[PDB]
């Protein structure tokens, strides 16, 4: 069920589970066997923060810095820590705007890229016209009955 929550993650119930139910988290039996509470939780919070940051880059255009602290539950310095790390790794592309206290998650599109998708849209409309063109004759049998 958490797999379907990757894109829909609101981080509402994630800190609830991390503070309450940890059946496979801090206690391992049939796989690792367990080591320490800080070993499994070190990379655990790093990925959960990455779960929302990937959705924001593919969904939200821009978000204020005050709103990022309410979701990720971090401070001003801790919020930009995980964001800047994903930029250097070639994963998330975002422009943090300090004066506006926002972050621009929309990737810049050149003049050729905007006209590229426009050519696919024109070819897509011709596919719908082609589909509708053959549905008139097919459904005509029921009309002329």
């Amino acid at each position: 069920s958490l797999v379907k929550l990757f894109t829909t993650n609101e981080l509402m119930r994630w800190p609830i589970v991390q503070k309450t139910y940890e059946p496979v988290l801090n206690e391992d039996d049939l796989a690792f066997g367990g080591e320490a509470n800080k070993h499994h939780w070190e990379d655990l919070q790093k990925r959960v923060i990455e779960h929302n940051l990937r959705v924001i880059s593919e969904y939200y255009s821009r978000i204020t810095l005050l709103r990022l602290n309410e979701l990720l539950d971090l401070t001003e310095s801790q919020t930009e820590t995980y964001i800047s790390d994903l930029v250097n790794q070639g994963i998330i592309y975002a422009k943090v705007n300090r004066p506006a206290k926002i972050v621009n998650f929309e990737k810049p599109k050149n003049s050729s890229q905007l006209l590229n998708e426009w050519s696919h849209n024109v070819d897509e409309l011709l596919e719908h016209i082609e589909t509708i063109g053959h549905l008139i004759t097919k459904e005509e049998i029921m009309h002329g009955l």
């Binding site: 003049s111 050729s112 905007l114 006209l115 426009w118 849209n121 897509e124 409309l125 719908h128 016209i129 082609e130 589909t131 509708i132 063109g133 053959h134 549905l135 008139i136 004759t137 097919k138 459904e139 005509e140 049998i141 009309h143 009955l145």
Partner: protein, 255 residues
């Protein structure tokens, strides 16, 4: 999806079976096509003609002789062993209700998905009137694939012996629009589902093209820039010819 490619030998054969048979009284001429449908591009290298008679007032009465199926198979295997029956064609663009019943006759002989070929003998359309449909599970629906012409020296050469851009495309767009205009008018007279579902997606995917006009002119002037240096080079071809012709004039006077 897949593609349909037909040599002009098959196209001309299906169009010549109407005049030779002398079919009249608004009837149809059914024939079989041969080729290989296993690949992604269906190639029809052969075609034939079979007698077909069906009542106009009764759609539940149809007859097809199966001897021609077994006779052409024994004839082709003794000549071309690479040709098998991939389906059949009809004599007109308009689809009838018997397409599902004819599909059950060749399902036992054909080893693959039967290919439904549609050829217009009247040629009242624009461009290529030939249509190609594929019957799949819906009960059964017909998926249409684009039809092309095979490029080979065994067919197109004989076409060149017998016979010897956007303006045509704009006339083809009017044919698709008039089909939707008559479909909406005739629908209101019969009342006061798949067409209406795909119709609203066309409008929302040319008022919307005006938002990218600011970014459209970005690459439009590049064409003029490419044409500016294109016209300048054209002078070097004409001026050199003037210099070449000027030297020819001096050779004729001295001679």
């Amino acid at each position: 999806h897949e593609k349909v490619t037909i040599a002009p030998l098959v196209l001309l054969s299906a169009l010549d079976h109407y005049e030779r048979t002398q079919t009249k009284e608004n009837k149809r001429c059914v024939g079989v096509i041969l080729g290989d449908a296993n690949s992604s591009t269906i190639r029809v290298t052969n075609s034939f003609a079979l007698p077909f008679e069906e009542d106009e007032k009764n759609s539940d009465v149809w007859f097809l002789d199966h001897n021609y199926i077994e006779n052409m198979n024994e004839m082709c295997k003794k000549i071309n062993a690479k040709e098998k029956l991939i389906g059949w064609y009809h004599s007109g663009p308009k689809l009838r209700a018997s397409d599902l019943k004819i599909n059950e006759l060749f399902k036992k002989y054909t080893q693959n998905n039967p290919l439904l070929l549609i050829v217009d003998v009247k040629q009242q359309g624009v461009g290529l009137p030939t249509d190609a449909y594929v019957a799949i599970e819906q009960e059964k629906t017909f998926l249409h694939l684009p039809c092309t012409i095979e490029a080979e020296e065994a067919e197109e050469i004989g076409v060149e012996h017998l016979l010897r851009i956007r303006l045509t495309n704009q006339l083809k767009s009017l044919k698709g629009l008039q089909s939707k205009l008559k479909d909406v008018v005739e629908y209101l007279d019969k009342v006061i589902h798949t067409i209406l579902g795909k119709l609203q997606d066309v409008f929302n995917l040319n008022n919307l093209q005006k938002a990218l006009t600011v970014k459209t002119n970005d690459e439009l002037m590049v064409i003029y820039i490419s044409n500016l240096v294109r016209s300048i080079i054209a002078f070097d071809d004409l001026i050199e010819n003037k210099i070449q012709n000027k030297k020819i004039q001096e050779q004729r006077v001295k001679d």
